[PDB]
Design an enzyme around this catalytic site. Structure first.
Site, PDB file in Angstrom:
ATOM      1  N   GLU A 157     -11.409   4.315  -0.029  1.00  0.00           N
ATOM      2  CA  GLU A 157     -11.643   4.815   1.310  1.00  0.00           C
ATOM      3  C   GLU A 157     -12.472   6.105   1.262  1.00  0.00           C
ATOM      4  OE1 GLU A 157      -8.629   3.959  -0.026  1.00  0.00           O
ATOM      5  OE2 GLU A 157      -7.113   5.519   0.453  1.00  0.00           O
TER       6      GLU A 157
ATOM      7  N   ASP B  43       0.813  -1.208   0.000  1.00  0.00           N
ATOM      8  CA  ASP B  43       0.000   0.000   0.000  1.00  0.00           C
ATOM      9  C   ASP B  43       0.840   1.249   0.000  1.00  0.00           C
ATOM     10  OD1 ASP B  43      -2.484   1.429   0.116  1.00  0.00           O
ATOM     11  OD2 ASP B  43      -2.538   1.252   2.301  1.00  0.00           O
TER      12      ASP B  43
END
Ligand SMILES: Nc1ncnc2c1ncn2[C@@H]1O[C@H](CSCC[C@H](N)C(=O)O)[C@@H](O)[C@H]1O
Ligand SMILES: COCc1ccccc1-c1cc(O)c2[nH]cnc(=O)c2c1
Ligand SMILES: [Cl-]
Ligand SMILES: [K+]
Ligand SMILES: [K+]
Ligand SMILES: [Mg+2]
EC number: 2.1.1.6
Length: 213
Positions: A197, A139
């Site tokens: 997100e 990530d």
């Protein structure tokens, strides 16, 4: 101050010390109501939770710590004696991450490694006493996902069954990584469709399980 400092202050003022779930809830609130930030978030986080619980990894490597959201998220689900190593190139992020961990009470499970993943990965065996990894969370930066996967393999850090879980394979997107692991007989791949997100924007995770050389 920075957005990252603002996130940390919000958690300190809106969460219970030593309660990882309240930390995650505080971050997610701040990032929904005030300022977006690139934490993996709750939608994709729920999928990560399911993966972590399925594999119960003893040793996880995270590439990209940022404010510590994903570290907190994973470390809270680890068994006693399991460990997370998180690599972070930005020292300001590292310092926020360490405070976030400390606040959540997970500092004993997590070690921050300061530097670029491409420099630290080759030191994992001799410097940090790693044999092989059980799970890797990618990530960091999209253009590093493929090179760092290849480098993990070269360094002997993957074993049969090592789980690679990659965020943001749709947005920002990691087309070279996906084409490579999906086409390689060294990886068994599953796509987990979700959302970016904090936003109504399709994103997803890829799980790529290493099958040996
Ligand atoms: N080559 C590299 N090595 C290590 N860290 C890197 C990197 N390139 C980018 N980063 C770091 O990767 C992070 C991406 S955001 C990480 C979010 C975190 N995993 C979470 O879900 O909560 C940033 O903090 C950035 O500084
Ligand atoms: C810097 O771009 C921010 C951004 C903007 C638009 C859409 C997505 C993202 C994004 C989302 C993420 O989960 C990320 N996670 C890790 N490294 C990132 O660079 C990253 C970027
Ligand atoms: Cl979310
Ligand atoms: K285990
Ligand atoms: K494959
Ligand atoms: Mg991400």
């Amino acid at each position: 101050d920075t957005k990252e400092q603002r996130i940390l202050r919000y958690v300190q003022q809106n969460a219970k010390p030593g309660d990882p779930q309240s930390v995650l809830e505080a971050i997610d609130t701040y990032c929904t109501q005030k300022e977006w930030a690139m934490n993996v978030g709750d939608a994709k986080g729920q999928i990560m939770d399911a993966v972590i619980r399925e594999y119960s990894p003893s040793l996880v490597l995270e590439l990209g710590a940022y404010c510590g959201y994903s570290a907190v998220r994973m470390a809270r689900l680890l068994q006693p004696g399991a460990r997370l190593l998180t690599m972070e190139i930005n020292p300001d992020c590292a310092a926020i991450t360490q405070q976030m961990l400390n606040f959540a009470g997970l500092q004993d499970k997590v070690t921050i490694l300061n530097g670029a993943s491409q420099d630290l990965i080759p030191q994992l065996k001799k410097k940090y006493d790693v044999d092989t990894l059980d799970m890797v969370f990618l990530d960091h930066w999209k253009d590093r996902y493929l090179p760092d996967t290849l480098l993990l393999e070269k360094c002997g850090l993957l074993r049969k069954g090592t789980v690679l879980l990659a965020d943001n394979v749709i947005v920002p997107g990691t087309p070279d990584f996906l084409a490579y692991v999906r086409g390689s007989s060294s990886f068994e791949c599953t796509h987990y469709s979700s959302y970016l997100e904090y936003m109504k924007v399709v994103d997803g995770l890829e799980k790529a399980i290493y099958q040996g050389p």
